[PDB]
Amino acid sequence: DDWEIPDGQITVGQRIGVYKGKWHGDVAVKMLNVTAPTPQQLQAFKNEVGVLRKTRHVNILLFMGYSTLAIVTQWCEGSSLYHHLHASETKFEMKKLIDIARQTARGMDYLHAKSIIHRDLKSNNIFLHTVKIGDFATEGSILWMAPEVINPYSFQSDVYAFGIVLYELMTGQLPYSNINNRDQIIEMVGRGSLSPDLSKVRSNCPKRMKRLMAECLKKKRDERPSFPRILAEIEELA
Amino acid sequence: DDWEIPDGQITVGQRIGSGTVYKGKWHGDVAVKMLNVPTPQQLQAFKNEVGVLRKTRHVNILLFMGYSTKPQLAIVTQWCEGSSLYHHLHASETKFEMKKLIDIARQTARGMDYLHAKSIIHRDLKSNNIFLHEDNTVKIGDFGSGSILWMAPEVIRNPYSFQSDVYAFGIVLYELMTGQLPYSNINNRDQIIEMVGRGSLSPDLSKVRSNCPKRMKRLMAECLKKKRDERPSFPRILAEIEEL
């Protein structure tokens, strides 16, 4: 019941943004580069470790251990969902898009069932190893913020962020393409006068998915569905 | 932390194989091993075997997800798409390039090194306890009067150890390169039990194919050593394959 990895067993490698490592195969290491952790740096570490060690799911990033500040997880080869959708030459077929949506819904459903709120769900936090949800959370990111988020964070907030991810999948683009100033999005979305353009969705997009999307993007936090129903709907049409 | 899944949360589906293994629905696809059973004496006997699976967080080890007490005792893991290394090698006949074979061997070395690092002895490593998820990722499971082909001589005749696992791995290496089971020439369990046990029978290395790294064949022999002590450990088993 100790996920403390004795330091010196890990061979850290190239920088990523976090290092690629070697422990009992390929691993991904997060090194907190400080002389001595502040009291704030300490609780941040415990909390991420505490919530990571309660996850055992195929669609959640595999936490492998910690070191005392370091967090060891599985190495994921490939790029994030952000790269593939926005900064990539190659697009995806619908069957794959719906598949990416389903796995993410499974992971999000798993977390919510464990009383865990990601509080930072976005296409950049979704690694396409097989969907892998990482970069945790408790138990630039403005585009994925619910109107009440601009305590605001809840299961409903994750539901909204999930809705934007759906929008990315079904359109390929980021929301609010006609805006280059962050302060107005904050104002317009925050007030309740701005919403993603669901007319941008592909012709291939099932009306079912387009409906579900609008539900997750509801202006009022309480009209948004729950992942048990979100997964049910996605699983059905698939 | 309790990893117990409350009664009713899992929807058991089709029987896969014989406890008994089923495919289920729990936050997605899962696998349920229904134990052939509860008695309060066996109740705590069940948790011991779970509190060991509880310390496996590795990509090459089958992902343990939770356990059940009601209705009956069950082990819950991830669901693996595709068949076993056994089926690929001796049934599907799927042609693997030498490139992939080494990687499968490499991943299995990673998984086994990790287990031994956790001081866990598998006691039964064979090509049908190794599942090729997505036909790419190796998943070692089923470690929590049958298959003797992977049994070391000291096991046939503290007989279970890290070196006995190493032997089973050598047989696996044999399967990967030879594309077939050892002692296929001889169809007699009692003969193999007798001859391997006394040390007069060993795998035929004339059947491994030409495209085989001579470090790997040399590595096979090290694991297939009839003498327990003459076998290399998994850190070194993995280091050499990795370098190779």
Ligand SMILES: CCN(C)S(=O)(=O)Nc1cccc(-c2nc(C(C)(C)C)sc2-c2ccnc(N)n2)c1F
């Ligand atoms: C972590 C490993 N332990 C929890 S274990 O020793 O109980 N390992 C464990 C746990 C649950 C199921 C199985 C399993 N067992 C199978 C045999 C060959 C023994 C009948 S197939 C199979 C399986 C698991 C997942 N997907 C598919 N398609 N098949 C398993 F090995």
